[PDB]
Amino acid sequence: VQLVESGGGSVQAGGSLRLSCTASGGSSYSTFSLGWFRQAPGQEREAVAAIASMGGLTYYADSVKGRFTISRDNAKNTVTLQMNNLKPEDTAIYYCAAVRGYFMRLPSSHNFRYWGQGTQVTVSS
């Protein structure tokens, strides 16, 4: 299967922005646990928020908790990351990821097998 990252763009600090991600392919979505990762120039790729399957448990990286809000729509096979108080530290390329599995902590790259191609998000003052 493949993942398709929607949304993205450059926004002014304090502004909002909503990344979206859809799973294309056929073989059930509710079997997947999904997660948004990001990566800025220089730093390695870190996790931002994930959402387990079989219920919808969500987990967030500290730097984004409170502002970011990940969710899922199994009917539409989509994961959604809602970023509300964007700060310049959020500036990076965000990747969507998937795995037909489960977990109960904020995951790591290691947990997913399917990845999107990345989406540039730029926050400036």
Residue numbers of the domain that contains 14: 1-125
Q: State the structure-solving technique.
A: X-ray
CATH number at residue 96: 2.60.40.10
Where is 4: in which H helix or E strand? strand 2-6
Q: Resolution to 1 decimal, in Å?
A: 2.9
* Whether the Cβ atoms of residue 34 and residue 94 lie closer than 8 Å to each other: no
Q: How far apart are CA 81 and CA 59, in angstroms?
A: 12
* Whether the Cβ atoms of residue 121 and residue 91 lie closer than 8 Å to each other: yes
* Whether the Cβ atoms of residue 60 and residue 47 lie closer than 8 Å to each other: no
Give the DSSP letter of residue 30: G
Q: How far apart are CA 19 and CA 10, in angstroms?
A: 12
Q: How many domains does the chain have?
A: 1
